[PDB]
Design a protein around this ligand. Structure first.
Ligand SMILES: Nc1ncnc2c1ncn2[C@@H]1O[C@H](COP(=O)(O)OP(=O)(O)NP(=O)(O)O)[C@@H](O)[C@H]1O
Ligand SMILES: Nc1ncnc2c1ncn2[C@@H]1O[C@H](COP(=O)(O)OP(=O)(O)NP(=O)(O)O)[C@@H](O)[C@H]1O
Ligand SMILES: Nc1ncnc2c1ncn2[C@@H]1O[C@H](COP(=O)(O)OP(=O)(O)NP(=O)(O)O)[C@@H](O)[C@H]1O
Ligand SMILES: [Mg+2]
Ligand SMILES: [Mg+2]
Ligand SMILES: [Mg+2]
Ligand SMILES: [Zn+2]
Lengths: 194, 129, 605, 176, 620, 195
């Protein structure tokens, strides 16, 4: 029915959604870079920022400054997307804590491909295989954790996987309410709290 | 709880002995003969196991009887202050040698004492002597 | 015998049909197959256990419930096998890597009134028993074989998948294949489960007068391992039985546990909604303060301090690895007969983890930790004192002034650093003591004597600095307060018969306990920037006042004012915010923290 | 789509009732019904059947497939097969819930019928779980689910479709 | 019968000559180094054969004997004679093991027969003893030699052989043992304990027994934080004709890594780029603690240390620096100790009331592998070539400080207990913290009465600092600002309203995956903690030497300090200046030279060292 | 970094997934607009300096401030639009006249948008048929019964059932009425559907 629905996240696509709060928060996360030419007047922030300076700045700003000729700055991957952590994911995707390793792991990784790194293919394959490995546990936990504390199950999941978990939980709760007949009652909305 | 204060030769100890005889589960102790640890509870190496074990003191052995403390003024302070928890909260809480537990001490304490200098002087209040 | 196998198969089929057919609900609303769905969801989650209620089994088939009560050792095996096959037909087909079926542990519980340890006479042997108690010791998890394979040592023939009896009883190896003892047990080709022995002390309410508390050995199996820790209060459902490896025909007894019920952390969503509503309503602080020790007239600021202690601040690990304690330490010096001991006895009951100790009844080793020789192994082992037993909770040290100085010295590391560093008997470790110390004490001269001033306190400055808040709760005589207090006391004594009814504008003790646990695990606040600025300025003014008072007296004050007091105000404000589940402490939260600390600082003027 | 809406579609299925009232043919927009003669069977949509049973105006008759022998055969066939088997009705779970919750008195051996329908439901949801896992593991582009019912698809399909959208975008993010 | 397929898989994996040559190169390195276990990365095994990697981690014993036989075949193909020179070639596994990364607490019974990587702290070790694997015997009556292999439940094949040797009858003739032709392997048992901070709430740390064989026996001592990769197994404790189901469990280790022990060119460039890098390091020492600059410099000197001299006459001059902090409540003494415990390699915590003279030095304990009693090292012996932090030092018993006296004075401790009479090495720097008598420092009493310790003990400390809770308003302003800033801080990898989680295991690879200034602030370019750890680890080794100018200035200023004591106030002098103070001056100058990585103690080092001594001796 | 004040608007809305409407962050909106004004003034000064003086090194920082400005715009527009989504859900979940405790959270322009949306929605609903349109806001759940039993939660005024017939909605009184007449009051919480 006509319930409130957030603007959906478009982080996994070629470009993120403009009005998505999730995409905005995802792109806020910082990204290491190396500056290719000195920038005047910005020494107050990191008077000129000298050439060759290492910086960590937001992903939206890195994408804004980044032109494919690599004229202003060079963009480097975060550690969690480099080969060692990709190997960690290859070991067993179920045990890594993607909530602590950036809450928007898949969205940040997908937008990290925009900079045309030589290991873009490796990053993409790592993201795909991580999702494939974690899918079954997400599915079973979401669809079988009925009416209990879901904190331990949902703790290690990134925000995309948390959305999938809530979708599965919503389906489970809907079917259980149907089977026990509670779905037939007409009830006041959540706004009765006011 | 009762406290019998007064001068010598007034049958206070005799009253305590009578209460010992009439009442079941009664015990009697005196002054320096008592100790803090013996009054409340004591931790010992068990004789055959040699592991630490908690054991009942006076106020735990009289857990639903009367503990009689004669010549109460003449105890040591460390011995005398040990009965505070037993006298009001009616438990004896022990945290020793790995034992952390509280025993029941639902005991009525009846005590006898002399004032300062032995003889009670009516010129002073009870708290003053 | 075929007749015996027929009996076992029939009983297994009856248990199977119980698990297949049992329902709860009504036709007016709907039905859910309780144990079918529990089996399916637990197996899909990888839990491989269920919890069959004896009352439900009795309602479905009373004969099965009676058989399981009288002869649980025989029939629980059949019930577990029935649950295994029901899980198979309920869950299959299963994806790749889940083809092999797993064994199911059928725990069970009951609504019946429990028995007691001293009620366990000889006639209760091999029956189901339900007793309460307190766990005082807990073994490390060890592996017990459920099925073994034995290979002949000489000719290398093998006997495989020999079923081991459950519990602490063992199995006799055959003496025929070769030597008199032909066999060894193959360490690879055997299947083992976790097991854990516990010691269950009799409840202090249940000890008869003058007796020491008895204790009973427990055997926990598979998923019952680590379901309970020392200090917890439980109801244990199990099988009273002999161990089966002074006097001759004697056998030691123990309870094979098959159901654990914590009598009082996984909250239900309904309880979480209640806790969120409690955090959301505007007067939750006053509601909590009224809920703390409702039988105690007055002392509202001290109750508020106890609320801040119960909820506690937020632990913080800084970039250099140094950790700041979130726990709040609260001392209550003052006059006798002023409900200090009763407030401690309430906090012990109310805190999610709570340990009550008498200062005079304590020792340095018993408070922090003890090193003792293990009798069965000759090694020196560690034993948790009160501050380790209360880790993640509150220590209530009553009559705190009666401790010897060397024993009060022992808790200095645990009060501030929240660790107990030990170097004794060749074992060297750093235990955790993340706990709050709530202390009660009387004045040096019994009552607080205002003419003598700082001489009323014998505690050192070093230990006084470690207390976040220090109350000098003086008993001030006043006829109006005395009349109202006496009326309250007499009505309280009259109210010992009126069904223990609840009160408006108050949280039940159990609900308050669970709410404290929820807020503790969930919310860690911080200070807002302007609030921190306010606290900074007020700290400078306070320190200047303390310095000038000390200069005017030409004597150092007993109670100091230090950076610990600043951080104490910080964590008090964080506790106030954590009551409301707010990520930040506002200027009003810092104002209430300053007000409470000002009450505790007028008490140091 | 909600389970109540799947029940709403399931309520269109035709069932037979024995009225205890007299009423001539009524011309409904979805199709005329009746005449309703006392004591004689008449076929009506399930919503009207449940409404009349609630109002004590008829006795419901079970469908031909609500039979313990037939349901046991269907259950054993479902457990024996790997693919979803053809079900007796396209809304069998909802039919079972409505008819047994409202007319257990009329329908004999309703406990056995309910338990067998639950067995079939558990088996087929397990098959759907296996199908979803195989889909994601093998990175299939499409699946074939011929004999699934609408309630079975609705129970797990929102999660599965969202997960497959995420998987598709993850495996296609190297398009240039 | 089926393991030839697994052996073929492992031999195919090892023969890396076709594609990358990694593991043929590693086997070649093994041959050249004369070693007999190959270190294999299961990540590479995953990349080449995921199926075999999963089988290896879940079916460990059969897969490992297959892998070892494949390794023996491969090393025979590379070098046959070297393959004959060893009984069998082992394989130790490193890399990422997925869910098998466990602690001693989480290592439950479901992990049996699996490869598991256990992280923890070593509590004890048994003595190394040989273990027979194959004994060779000779028959003089027959001029013939025979052999017998031996196995027990610990071995991978796990059959229990008879313990005794063939003795008086083979061919009904007497045999005798050829010990030289027989082969024995080293055997050791250690106990790995859970990390104490990671236990849940009131639970004490749990532990698991570990068995080391052959070349692994040296690689762990008590106090080490290690990661042990091995196979988890139960040992049936049969009585003979009967057993209880209760079996003890052990971890047969195949690899051990020291996870806390452990490029220099960038350090040697940074010491040139930075100006007086000692000051920057000292300021960046404990960022959370404001002020106490000279104390931080002294702690950095303690961390770096002097150089221990051996004289031609055989006497030695102790190189460690000992620091005693005395001060009021709440002046960060305990926090400075905690920072040193976190930053330094092999820093042992200790507190005055919670320790004993026995536990500080050594205790007689029964080794349950045999029943014989041996010395188990105490705190200061564990701290050898390290630091020991003693909080509440004024609360120790005198009999307990008798132990500390020898350790500080001579760098040893003498023990005479059980069957052993020995001088144990206890060469450690002591960083002690104490409160003055009466809790708070009294300005109206002499320092020797505020300080309750005996003058004999105080002579053993290089530097003694008195630090006071002086309630100056400006100092209070800056301190409170820093404290509230620290309490306001939250980590970037944490949500805006999180309470920090209680400890749980979070290490999921045998080697660290993410492989110099702080970025937030402008003032003075604070150094990061990791770089400081690495720099101190490098700079401790430099070993600089005195110069004529620095020696002359140290001697002149020491003479000034001594002559200044003639008219200095006896009522307020912190400690009497003596030759011990001169030793302190030399050690501090050497430590400053180590900080600069200079290789020559210069006049700058002498100036800073004697400034520090002047402050410590004649300033509050 | 510049953007953090804009991120507080975003974090405010993201911290309430349930769809309830927080108070309008007027001060935060003023601050981010002031920041954009300052950024634009600096950018204009720098860009005209660079172009007039022929100085080329300014162009990276020009792009820096330009991207920062576009970021500020994206954040505030997303904030306003998500607030519009939350407001739009109120017409369907509760009804037309919002309670004053919630109406106090809305901006005046938000009430303007909401009134325009209500007028547009009512116009669309009227235009669906020849006379009286179709009230698609009703029939939110599938219908089960023609009549329902309802219980009055709020002490409330007279409620017309049909013309001269009406029912007094006094608290705890219980009526049996048509579902389509009672649906709006149940959704508003005046009535409780039972059974
Ligand atoms: N009123 C009395 N009637 C009978 N005997 C009495 C009375 N007063 C004292 N006595 C006797 O006095 C003797 C001493 O009694 P005792 O109980 O020891 O006195 P007390 O109060 O304890 N004096 P003291 O021990 O010095 O404090 C006993 O033989 C009593 O019987
Ligand atoms: N304000 C109060 N309201 C209710 N009961 C009170 C109050 N003050 C004292 N009491 C009662 O007085 C008795 C003694 O209380 P208690 O808890 O021992 O206070 P206390 O100050 O700790 N005593 P002490 O150990 O000598 O300092 C108990 O029965 C209390 O309930
Ligand atoms: N200069 C400071 N900067 C930051 N925090 C400080 C400072 N001085 C004290 N503190 C804080 O004060 C608290 C107590 O520190 P602590 O190290 O125990 O003091 P201490 O000198 O050891 N006093 P004590 O343990 O009573 O002898 C800690 O939380 C410190 O972080
Ligand atoms: Mg007498
Ligand atoms: Mg008390
Ligand atoms: Mg300290
Ligand atoms: Zn045999």
């Amino acid at each position: 029915s006509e319930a409130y629905f957030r603007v959906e996240s478009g982080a996994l696509g070629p470009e993120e959604n403009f009005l998505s709060l999730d995409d905005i928060l995802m792109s806020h996360e910082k990204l290491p870079v190396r500056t290719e030419t000195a920038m005047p007047r910005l020494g107050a922030f990191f008077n000129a920022v000298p050439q060759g300076s290492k910086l960590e700045l937001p992903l939206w700003l890195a994408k804004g400054l980044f032109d494919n000729k690599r004229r202003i700055l060079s963009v480097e991957l975060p550690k969690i997307y480099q080969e060692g952590w990709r190997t960690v994911f290859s070991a067993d995707p179920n045990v890594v804590d993607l909530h602590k390793m950036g809450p928007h792991f898949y969205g940040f990784g997908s937008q990290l491909l925009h900079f045309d790194s030589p290991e873009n293919a490796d990053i993409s394959q790592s993201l795909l295989q991580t999702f494939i490995g974690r899918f079954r546990r997400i599915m079973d936990s979401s669809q079988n954790a009925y009416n209990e504390d879901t904190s331990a199950l949902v703790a290690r999941l990134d925000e995309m996987e948390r959305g999938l978990f809530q979708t599965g939980q919503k389906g489970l709760n809907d079917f259980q309410c149907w089977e026990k007949g509670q779905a037939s009652q007409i009830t006041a909305s959540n706004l009765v709290q006011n | 709880n009762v406290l019998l204060c007064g001068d010598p030769g007034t049958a206070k100890s005799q009253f305590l002995k009578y209460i010992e005889k009439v009442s079941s589960r009664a015990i009697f102790t005196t002054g320096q003969g008592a100790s803090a640890v013996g009054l409340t509870a004591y931790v010992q190496r068990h004789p055959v196991s040699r592991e630490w074990t908690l054991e009942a003191g006076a106020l735990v052995l009289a857990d639903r009887g009367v503990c009689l403390i004669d010549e109460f003024d003449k105890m040591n302070d460390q011995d005398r202050t040990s009965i505070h928890e037993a006298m009001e909260q009616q438990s004896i809480s022990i945290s020793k040698a790995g034992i952390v537990t509280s025993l029941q001490a639902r005991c009525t304490v009846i005590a006898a004492a002399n004032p300062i200098g032995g003889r009670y002087d009516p010129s002073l209040t009870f708290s003053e002597n | 015998a075929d007749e015996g196998q027929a009996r076992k198969s029939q009983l297994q089929r009856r248990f199977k049909e119980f698990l297949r057919q049992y329902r709860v609900g009504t036709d007016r609303t709907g039905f859910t197959f309780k144990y079918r769905d529990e089996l399916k969801r637990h197996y899909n989650l990888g839990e491989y256990w269920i919890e069959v209620e004896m009352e439900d089994l009795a309602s479905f088939d009373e004969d099965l419930a009676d058989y399981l009560y009288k002869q649980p050792a025989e029939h629980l095996q059949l019930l577990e096998e029935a649950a295994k096959e029901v899980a198979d037909e309920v869950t299959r087909p299963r994806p790749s890597g889940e083809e092999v079926l797993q064994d199911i542990q059928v725990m069970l519980k009951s609504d019946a009134s429990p028995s007691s340890i001293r009620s366990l006479k000889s006639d209760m042997m091999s029956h189901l028993v339900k007793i309460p108690g307190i766990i005082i010791a807990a073994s490390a998890v060890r592996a017990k074989a459920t099925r073994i394979s034995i290979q002949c040592r000489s000719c290398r023939n093998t006997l495989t998948n020999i079923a081991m009896r459950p519990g602490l009883e063992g199995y006799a190896l055959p003496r025929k294949c070769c030597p008199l003892d032909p066999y060894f047990i193959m360490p690879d080709k055997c299947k083992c489960v976790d097991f854990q022995t516990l010691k269950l002390q009799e409840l202090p309410d249940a000890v008869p007068h003058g007796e020491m508390p008895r204790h009973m050995q427990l055997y926990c199996d598979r998923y019952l391992c680590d379901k309970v820790v020392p200090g917890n209060r439980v109801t244990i459902m199990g099988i009273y039985s002999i161990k089966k490896f002074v006097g001759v025909g004697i056998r030691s007894s123990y309870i094979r546990v098959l159901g654990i019920q914590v009598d009082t952390g996984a909250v239900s969503p309904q309880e979480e909604e209640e806790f969120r509503r409690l955090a959301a309503l505007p007067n939750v602080y006053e509601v909590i303060s009224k809920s703390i020790a409702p039988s105690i007239f007055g002392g509202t600021d001290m109750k508020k301090a106890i609320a801040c202690l119960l909820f506690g601040g937020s632990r913080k690990r800084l970039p250099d690895g140094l950790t700041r304690r979130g726990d709040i330490n609260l001392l209550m010096l003052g006059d006798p007969g002023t409900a200090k001991s009763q407030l401690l006895k309430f906090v012990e009951k109310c805190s999610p983890i709570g340990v009550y100790t008498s200062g005079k009844g304590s020792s340095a080793a018993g408070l922090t930790a003890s090193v003792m020789r293990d009798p069965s192994s000759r090694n020196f082992i560690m034993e948790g004192g009160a501050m380790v037993l209360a880790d993640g909770g509150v220590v209530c040290i009553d009559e705190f002034d009666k401790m010897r100085e060397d024993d009060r010295v022992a808790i200095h590391e645990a009060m501030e650093q929240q660790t107990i560093s030990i170097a004794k008997a060749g074992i060297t470790t750093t235990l955790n003591s993340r706990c709050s110390v709530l202390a009660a004490a009387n004045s040096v001269f019994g009552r607080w004597d205002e003419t003598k001033g700082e001489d009323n306190i014998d505690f050192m400055p070093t230990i006084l600095s470690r207390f976040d808040m220090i109350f000098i709760v003086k008993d001030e005589h006043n006829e109006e307060r005395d009349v109202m207090l006496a009326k309250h006391v007499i009505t309280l004594h009259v109210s010992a018969l009126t069904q223990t009814q609840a009160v408006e504008g108050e949280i039940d003790l159990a609900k308050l306990k669970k709410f404290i646990a929820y807020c503790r695990v969930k919310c860690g606040p911080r200070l807002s920037a302007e609030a921190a600025e306010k606290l900074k300025n007020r700290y400078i003014i306070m320190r200047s006042g303390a310095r000038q008072h000390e200069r005017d007296s030409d004597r150092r004050s007993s109670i100091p004012i230090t950076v610990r007091q600043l951080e104490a105000i910080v964590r008090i404000a964080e506790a106030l915010s954590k009551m409301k589940l707010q990520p930040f402490a506002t200027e009003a939260d810092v104002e209430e923290a300053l007000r409470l600390f000002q009450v505790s600082t007028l008490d140091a003027a | 789509m909600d389970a109540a809406e799947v029940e709403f579609l399931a309520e269109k299925e035709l069932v037979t009732i024995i009225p205890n009232f007299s009423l001539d043919k009524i011309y409904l927009i979805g199709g005329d019904l009746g005449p309703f003669n006392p004591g004689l069977p008449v076929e009506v949509p399930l919503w009207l059947a449940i409404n009349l049973k609630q109002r004590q105006k008829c006795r419901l008759l079970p469908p031909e497939w609500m039979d313990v022998e037939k349901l046991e055969k269907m259950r054993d066939h479902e457990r024996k097969e790997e693919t979803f088997t053809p079900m007796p009705s396209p809304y069998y779970m909802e039919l079972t819930k409505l008819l047994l919750n409202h007319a257990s008195d009329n329908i004999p051996k309703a406990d056995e019928i309910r338990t067998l329908v639950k067995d079939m439901w558990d088996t087929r949801i397990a098959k759907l779980r296996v199908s979803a896992d195989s889909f994601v593991r093998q990175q299939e582009a499409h699946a074939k689910l011929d004999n699934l019912t609408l309630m079975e698809i609705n129970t797990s399909g929102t999660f599965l479709t969202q997960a497959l959208n995420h998987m598709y975008k993850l495996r296609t993010n190297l398009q240039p | 019968v089926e393991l030839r397929e697994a052996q073929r898989d492992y031999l195919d994996f090892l023969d890396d000559e076709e594609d990358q040559g990694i593991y043929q190169s590693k086997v070649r390195e093994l041959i050249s180094d004369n070693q007999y276990r190959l270190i294999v990365n299961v990540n590479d095994l995953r990349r080449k054969n995921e199926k075999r990697a999963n089988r290896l981690l879940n079916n460990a014993f059969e897969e490992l004997v297959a892998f070892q036989r494949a390794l023996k075949d491969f090393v025979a193909s590379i070098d046959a004679t070297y393959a004959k020179q060893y009984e069998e070639f082992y394989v130790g596994l490193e890399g990422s093991f997925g869910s098998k990364h466990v602690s001693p607490r989480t290592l439950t019974s479901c992990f049996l027969s699996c490869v598991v990587c256990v992280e923890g702290i070593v509590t004890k070790c048994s003595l190394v003893r040989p273990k027979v694997v194959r004994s060779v015997h000779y028959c003089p009556a027959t001029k013939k030699t025979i052999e017998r292999r031996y196995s027990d439940l610990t071995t991978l094949v796990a059959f229990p052989s008879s313990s005794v040797y063939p003795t008086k009858d083979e061919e009904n003739n007497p045999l005798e043992t050829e010990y030289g032709l027989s082969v024995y392997k080293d055997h050791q048992t250690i106990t790995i304990q859970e990390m104490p901070e990671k236990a849940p709430a009131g639970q004490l740390p749990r532990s698991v027994d570990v068995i080391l064989d052959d070349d692994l026996v040296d690689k762990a001592k008590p106090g080490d934080r290690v990661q042990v990769v091995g196979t988890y197994r139960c040992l049936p404790g049969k009585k003979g004709g009967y057993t209880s189901g209760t079996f003890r469990t052990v971890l047969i280790a195949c690899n051990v890594k020291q996870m806390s022990k452990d490029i220099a060119k960038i350090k040697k460039f940074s010491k040139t780029r930075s100006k007086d890098i000692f000051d920057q390091l000292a300021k960046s020492l404990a960022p959370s603690i404001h002020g106490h600059d000279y104390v931080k410099k002294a702690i950095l000197c303690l961390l770096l240390g002097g150089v221990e001299r051996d004289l031609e006459n055989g006497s030695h001059i102790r190189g460690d620096i000992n620091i005693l902090l005395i001060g009021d409540p709440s002046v960060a003494k305990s926090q400075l100790l905690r920072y040193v415990l976190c930053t330094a390699p092999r820093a042992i915590p200790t507190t005055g009331r919670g320790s004993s003279g026995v536990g500080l030095t050594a205790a007689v304990t029964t080794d349950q592998e045999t029943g014989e009693r041996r010395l188990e090292a105490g705190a200061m012996v564990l701290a050898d070539r390290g630091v020991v932090c003693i909080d509440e030092f004024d609360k120790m018993s005198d009999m307990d400080r008798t132990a500390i006296h020898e350790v500080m004075e001579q760098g040893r401790v003498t023990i005479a207990k059980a069957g052993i009479h020995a001088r144990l090495n206890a060469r450690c720097s002591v960083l002690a913290a104490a409160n003055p008598v009466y809790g708070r420092y009294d300005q109206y009493k002499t320092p020797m009465e505020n300080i309750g310790l005996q003058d004999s003990l105080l002579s053993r400390f290089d530097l003694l600092f008195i630090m006071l809770d002086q309630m100056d308003p400006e100092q209070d302003r800056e301190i409170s600002d820093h404290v509230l800033r620290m309490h306001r801080y939250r980590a970037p990898g944490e949500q805006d309203g999180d309470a920090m989680p209680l400890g749980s295991a979070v290490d999921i690879l045998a080697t660290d995956d993410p492989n110099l200034h702080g970025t937030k602030k402008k003032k003075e370019k604070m150094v990061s903690a990791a770089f400081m750890k690495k720099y101190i680890h490098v700079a401790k080794i430099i070993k600089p030497v005195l110069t004529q100018e620095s020696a002359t200035y140290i001697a002149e200023e020491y003479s000034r300090l001594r002559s200044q004591d003639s008219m200095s106030s006896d009522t307020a002098r912190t400690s009497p200046v003596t030759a011990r103070t001169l030793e302190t001056l030399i050690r501090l100058a050497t430590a400053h030279a180590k900080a600069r990585m200079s290789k020559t103690v210069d006049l700058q080092d002498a100036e800073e060292a004697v400034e520090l001594v002047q402050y410590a001796y004649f300033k509050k | 970094m510049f953007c953090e004040k804009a991120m507080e608007l975003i974090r405010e809305l993201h911290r309430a997934p349930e769809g309830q409407l927080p108070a309008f962050n007027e001060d935060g909106l003023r601050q981010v607009l002031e920041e954009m004004k300052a950024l634009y003034e600096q950018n204009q000064s720098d860009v005209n300096e660079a172009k007039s003086g022929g100085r080329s090194d300014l162009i990276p920082t020009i792009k820096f401030r330009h991207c920062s400005l576009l970021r500020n715009r994206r954040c505030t527009v997303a904030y306003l639009y998500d607030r519009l989504l939350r407001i739009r859900a109120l017409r369907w979940e509760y009804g037309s006249v919002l309670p004053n405790a919630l109406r106090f959270h809305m901006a005046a322009e938000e009430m303007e948008w909401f009134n325009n949306y209500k007028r547009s929605l009512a116009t669309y609903m009227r235009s669906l048929g020849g006379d009286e349109g179709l009230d698609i806001t009703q029939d939110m759940k599938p219908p089960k019964s023609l009549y329902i039993e309802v219980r009055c939660l709020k002490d409330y005024g007279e409620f017309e059932v049909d013309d001269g017939t009406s029912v007094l909605l006094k608290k705890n009184s219980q009526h049996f009425l048509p579902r389509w007449k009672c649906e709006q009051l149940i959704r508003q919480g005046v009535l409780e559907h039972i059974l």
